[PDB]
Swiss-Prot record:
Similarity field: Belongs to the mut-7 family.
Disulfide bonds: none
Protein's name in the database: Exonuclease mut-7 homolog
Function noted in UniProt: Possesses 3'-5' exoribonuclease activity. Required for 3'-end trimming of AGO1-bound miRNAs.
Length: 244
């Protein structure tokens, strides 16, 4: 998994001025120049990753950043000319693209690369990388990757659904829970076991945190009132039987 990102002299001076004329906003002119660049290109996908790496913007990409537009025009280039992945991208090249956009925490750029390189056709190749992130306690990242790769059948509530609830990051965990009905039962069943056990909910929480080694937990939320409000929503939002 090592891309040969080194540029050459025919291409490098061209790129240096491109960064200069990119400062002149982002619109149809900069888009058209990229479309012509990808046309001369041999294997645009591999070069699209090279252009993404050779710009100081790839550390924090946003809609205005040059790195985001480099991949954005690659997506338009693929759809306009009706391009496929055959004989151009390999599982090795997809892994290269995954490592480039998974660390940034930017979901839109990841969703774009999922579409460009067609990650949903071979999503099972990234499961070792997501479980490595779960083992590194990167719940929001691994959780969002699992949602954008549509891995709604690969993970249990303990992998990142419950830790994200511990970290008050209800948004990502509930998004994964909405598309995974199999977990909706045991999740609210587990949250109710904290209350309907007449042991302090803080003791029930601390026992789960120490069993699954949950880190960076937002303790101010783990109390009877805020944890009850979470069970009240998740039982109603998913029509769960009265197993209180």
């Amino acid at each position: 998994d090592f891309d040969i990102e080194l540029d050459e002299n025919i291409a490098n001076w061209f790129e240096g001025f491109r960064d200069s004329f990119k400062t002149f906003k982002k619109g149809p002119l900069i888009s058209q120049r990229l479309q012509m660049f990808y046309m001369n290109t041999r294997n645009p996908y591999e070069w699209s990753l090279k252009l993404f790496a050779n710009c100081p913007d790839h550390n924090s990409p946003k809609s205005n950043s040059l790195a985001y537009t480099v991949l954005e025009e690659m997506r338009n280039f693929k759809k306009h000319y009706n391009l496929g992945t055959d004989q151009l991208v390999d599982d090795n090249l997809r892994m290269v693209a995954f490592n480039f956009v998974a660390k940034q925490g930017h979901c839109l750029l990841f969703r774009m690369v999922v579409d460009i390189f067609e990650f949903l056709q071979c999503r099972d190749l990234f499961i070792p990388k997501v479980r490595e992130m779960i083992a590194r306690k990167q719940y929001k990242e691994a959780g969002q990757i699992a949602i954008d790769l549509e891995l709604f059948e690969e993970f249990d509530e303990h992998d990142f659904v419950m830790p994200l609830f511990m970290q008050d990051k209800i948004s990502i965990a509930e998004d994964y829970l909405n598309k995974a009905e199999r977990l909706q039962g045991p999740v609210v069943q587990l949250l109710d076991s904290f209350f309907d056990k007449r042991q302090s909910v803080e003791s029930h929480c601390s026992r789960y945190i120490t069993e699954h080694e949950v880190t960076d937990v937002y303790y101010s939320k783990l109390h009877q009132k805020p944890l009850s409000k979470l069970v009240q929503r998740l039982a109603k939002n998913y029509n769960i039987p009265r197993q209180f």
